[PDB]
């Protein structure tokens, strides 16, 4: 149920069967790209929600709470990249 | 060129060819699916927030809104778009 489980399964695959490497490293590359684009948009959405709240635009606060909730759910599945460029999960996040 | 559907069938072809892989790689496929769905849920929410901003005519955040549009369009290049009949379809 974590992004890391998926990463490890791909690698385990072409470790065990090397003929799958080119293909599965391709799949890993796409999963990596998808996670990156998602986190890019999520950060932008978070910045938009900060704008809303800082401006006192309470009419949109529900959608902002939704965004908060969606980000927290995402981090559970995918963790968070720390200051050193390392993706970490749970209490390792702080 | 880099497409979600490409990733998804790479997994299926793998366990097709080596059934001992099905448990782990189908789990992997399920996680990739869940990631796409969660991202698309947030994206749609972000879109409606930009929609609200633009209906208020708030120019201060128009830049962020146009960034959202740019990101949603790049996403559809990779992951396609679900049409009204539930079929994920990729730009032609």
Author numbering:
A (entry chain A): 3 to 96
B (entry chain B): 2 to 93
Q: Would you copy out the relevant sentences from the publication that reported this structure?
A:
(c) Structural overlay of the X-ray crystal structures of the AcrE1 proteins with an N-terminal (blue) and C-terminal (red) 6×His tag reveals virtually identical structures. Thus, the unusual nature of the C-terminal sheet was not a result of the presence of the 6×His affinity purification tag fused to the C terminus. The C-terminal β-sheet region is unusual because both sides of the sheet are exposed to solvent, contrasting with typical β-sheets, which pack a hydrophobic surface on one side against helices or other sheets. We also examined the packing of the C-terminal β-sheet within the crystal and observed no contacts that stabilize it in this position. Residues 82 to 90 form an antiparallel β-sheet that protrudes at a 90° angle from the end of helix 3. This sheet structure appears to be stabilized by multiple interactions between residues at the base of the sheet and residues in helices 1, 2, and 3. A salt bridge is formed between E41 and R89.
One mechanism by which phages and other mobile genetic elements are able to overcome the CRISPR-Cas system is through the expression of anti-CRISPR proteins. We previously reported that gene 34 from Pseudomonas phage JBD5, which encodes the protein AcrE1, shows anti-CRISPR activity against the type I-E system of P. aeruginosa strain SMC4386 (4). We show that AcrE1 binds to the CRISPR-associated helicase/nuclease Cas3 and that the C-terminal region of the anti-CRISPR protein is important for its inhibitory activity. In summary, these experiments demonstrate that AcrE1 functions by blocking the activity of Cas3 without inhibiting the DNA-binding activity of Cascade.
